[PDB]
Point group: C3
Chain length 276, copies 3
């Protein structure tokens, strides 16, 4: 003998056809069932079912109950929803290392190769080590993303009007018309359809045409602009106003009136020379 | 018999109460222990412990040692730190397919449904296939994020001053005062508190008021501006300077002096006509 | 006896040295092999190999076949490529709960601690719950990233020219030369190297110098600018043009010619007084 079993209680019952029943109180019923240990049971229609260890209940068909007081709790499944799997799954049985009120760890596993090999904590730690980089990057991206929201909306607040009015706080305008132009070299222009033309010129105003070299127009041939609030020229190069003109205009007036009386002077002389 | 064991060495010892001891040299001590195979041992307080296969050592209580020279290396645990799990865990035993110096693969596993079913490489490959999309996206985001840092900081370098001075490289200013205005239609304005008013006008300068139609002010009623470095008008519409004024002013001078002597001419005649 | 086996067919063969053979038709050949159940086989060089349950084939060395009609399908491996693992792996055997045409679930597993403990669906669900946050964030980032592409490229389209020409649609220019300047306080300037100098002034034009208080230059000492299309001043402060000048110029002309004949008048009188 090389099969010893130190017990005295009710004997093993290998009942089902071609069973196998070992240890005290071990009833085995499912055909081709196997029960090993103290008080194990392989129930009725648990075809080919195995219960190995104290109080182990092989409940299901083709499935297994391993270790003290483990049950089978599922059995073979058909077209079942496996976690993460995109298409119905199938199972020919179950291998249970536990029960409803007690699970066990599975220890000392080499990593996995085939898709139907078991995975281990070490293999999972590689994913998590990645996820946690994608994680930390997403935060590092969030701030970058946020700071560029506070940076851009400074531009659209700092600028903004320069698009609309086409101006700045010290360079306003109020126009709907066509776009301005600096045709000739070195030129400047201002206002609606402001056609500069000649060299070094300036077409200052809505629809103004400076079409001669070095000039500074304030209008066109038909529409022409006055120049208000101007000072009386001092240097030879300074512009002259009406206050200085009128002064001349009135100076002419004296001249005419002095001359008026001179001619009435000379008529009288001439009258007298014929007379006296 | 349907239980054969081709051996000759020391006999199986099923020592502990209700043990089970099979194969040569197989000592079994833990109560309700089970040892099957060559030279297996279920030690002292390895209650309900199973050692199945060559030199297999069931060391712990309620746990299992499966396969040639596997040991149990943990046993049931209490409030233990499981990987990735957020709350203490519990274990009623261990199922070992190996030992310190040799682990095994677990093969031919259907995917997992319940949270306490084993996971397989295929199920993990679904996560990794995702992670690696989040991964590649994060890179695709990084460049986009970076290129918009080099794009925006061109705007704040290309522009920048237009916020500060309210100007461009050919349109400067130096003012702290209030904002300019183009009140009337078609108008333009320039400088601190530059109040344009009338139609088509221009209020050129810090605090300048062009309040009449089509005009071009360079000041207000009290403060008024000269116009330096101006050319002598040629066309009927061109502005006139002092160089052309003085020339008139001096032309008047001749006129007065010629006239001065004319009147001293006429006095003498008149003197003589009374005389001779 | 506590080892019962209800059968009648061909007897168990424990052939290999120190084998163990249980149940009908169970041939066991590998040395130290163990076969338990109906029609199990532990083949030739399946050293220490275990086949437990109906038609179970222990094919490989040191490996295991568990449950009705499971095979070993790999055996111990050497320097093998494990999924996700960065360095060759090793395995001392295999623990099979299935075969080519039928896998099983492993149920009732406590989570995993060591790197070589089995992982369970619950432990994987923690990773996926994260991944799916990194996922949803990446989408939330994508839109943010995209909307800031449509926001910035409005700025470079809304602005754009203001960098190039240094202007707006109503404030043009055409110059390559040096940058403008508002040296003195309260000042404005316009054009290439436009050197304003005095207070409240304006240096309107490419290379123009307004170097006196409150003035409005349109050039420098050598280069000086005309002012085309100007209106005839009305108020005392309004600029005067040639149309008003010429009118004076011609008014002088009358004055001279009236005076020409006055002097030829007076010569004749004087001639006559000597004569008659
Ligand atoms: Cl991720």
């Amino acid at each position: 003998k090389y099969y010893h079993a130190n017990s005295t209680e009710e004997d093993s019952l290998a009942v089902g056809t071609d069973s196998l029943a070992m240890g005290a109180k071990t009833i085995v019923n499912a055909d081709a069932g196997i029960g090993i240990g103290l008080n194990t049971l392989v129930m009725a229609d648990a075809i080919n079912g195995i219960a190995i260890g104290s109080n182990a209940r092989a409940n299901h068909a083709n499935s297994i109950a391993m270790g003290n007081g483990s049950q089978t709790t599922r059995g073979a499944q058909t077209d079942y929803t496996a976690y993460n799997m995109d298409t119905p799954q199938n199972s020919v049985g179950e291998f249970s290392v536990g029960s409803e009120d007690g699970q066990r760890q599975i220890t000392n596993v080499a990593a996995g190769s085939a898709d139907t090999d078991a995975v281990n904590v070490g293999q999972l730690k590689v994913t998590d080590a990645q996820v946690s980089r994608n994680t930390q990057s997403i935060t590092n991206l969030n701030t970058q993303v946020s700071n560029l929201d506070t940076r851009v909306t400074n531009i659209e607040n700092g600028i903004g009007d320069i698009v609309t009015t086409g101006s700045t706080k010290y360079f306003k305008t109020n126009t709907d018309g066509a776009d301005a132009n600096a045709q000739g070299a070195d030129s400047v222009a201002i206002g609606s359809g402001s056609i500069a033309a000649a060299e070094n010129s300036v077409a200052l105003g809505t629809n103004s045409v400076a079409d001669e070299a070095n000039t500074v127009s304030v209008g066109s041939s038909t529409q022409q602009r006055r120049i208000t609030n101007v000072a009386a020229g001092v240097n030879n190069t300074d512009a002259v106003n009406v206050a200085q003109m009128k002064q001349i205009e009135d100076k002419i007036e004296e001249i005419l009136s002095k001359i008026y009386h001179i001619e009435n002077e000379i008529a009288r002389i001439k009258k007298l020379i014929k007379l006296h």
